[PDB]
Amino acid sequence: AEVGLVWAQSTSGVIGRGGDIPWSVPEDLTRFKEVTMGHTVIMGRRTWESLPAKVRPLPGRRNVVVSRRPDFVAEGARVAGSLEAALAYAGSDPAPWVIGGAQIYLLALPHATRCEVTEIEIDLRRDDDDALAPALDDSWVGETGEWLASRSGLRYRFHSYRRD
Numbered sequence: 001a002e003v004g005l006v007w008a009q010s011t012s013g014v015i016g017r018g019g020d021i022p023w024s025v026p027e028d029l030t031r032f033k034e035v036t037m038g039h040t041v042i043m044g045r046r047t048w049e050s051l052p053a054k055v056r057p058l059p060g061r062r063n064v065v066v067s068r069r070p071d072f073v074a075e076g077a078r079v080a081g082s083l084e085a086a087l088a089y090a091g092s093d094p095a096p097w098v099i100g101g102a103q104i105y106l107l108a109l110p111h112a113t114r115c116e117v118t119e120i121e122i123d124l125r126r127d128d129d130d131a132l133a134p135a136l137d138d139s140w141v142g143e144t145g146e147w148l149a150s151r152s153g154l155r156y157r158f159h160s161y162r163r164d
């Protein structure tokens with residue numbers, strides 16, 4: 001099983017602020033759908049909460065929420081008490097995806113063999129309570145696309161990385 005991580009970050013490494021994603025780049029949500037469609041999507045409890053209620057569970061995917069609380073309620077999702085448990089509920093899924101947030105990416109990173117990153121050209125100065133992207137060392141190899149204009153007026157680009 002190829003455990004993948006998918007996220008969007010500013011160039012500075014911010015993925016979340018004030019419980020939200022601090023930009024609007026539609027092309028990123030489209031990409032996210034394209035990558036994750038048909039697979040398990042594993043998320044931390046706070047990410048689950050960040051999603052608008054009507055958008056969740058994410059359709060066409062098996063949703064899993066990681067919590068320490070074995071009685072946590074996620075309507076339309078399986079709740080798991082660890083990342084290892086989350087990966088077990090993925091079953092025979094050949095390519096489960098971890099979809100955030102900061103805490104869960106760090107948990108998953110040792111299992112991961114693929115990362116799909118959208119970089120957003122926005123000037124965000126890291127605050128103390130920002131959610132931050134994991135750093136990838138050079139065991140990770142891949143390709144970086146060209147800068148693209150979003151409908152938003154910001155630029156973005158895709159990075160695809162893998163390791164054995």
Ligand SMILES: NC(=O)C1=CN([C@@H]2O[C@H](COP(=O)(O)OP(=O)(O)OC[C@H]3O[C@@H](n4cnc5c(N)ncnc54)[C@H](OP(=O)(O)O)[C@@H]3O)[C@@H](O)[C@H]2O)C=CC1
Binds near residue numbers: 044069
């Ligand atoms: N730009 C992007 O690509 C994305 C951005 N985000 C943003 O990221 C932020 C959320 O990230 P973050 O705050 O780090 O939270 P997470 O989504 O990573 O969830 C953290 C929670 O996961 C549970 N948890 C953590 N570690 C463990 C463990 N070892 N075992 C079991 N459960 C565990 C806990 O839930 P509990 O307390 O219930 O036990 C904890 O509160 C939001 O702002 C969101 O909008 C999210 C997804 C993608």
Ligand SMILES: COc1cc(Cc2cnc(N)nc2N)cc(OC)c1OC
Binds near residue numbers: 020021050052100
């Ligand atoms: C489809 O809507 C959402 C998707 C995500 C997760 C996510 C979004 N973009 C990327 N590139 N990777 C991800 N893991 C996170 C969200 O909010 C925190 C979303 O709603 C706004």
Ligand SMILES: [Cl-]
Binds near residue numbers: 117119159
């Ligand atoms: Cl990067």
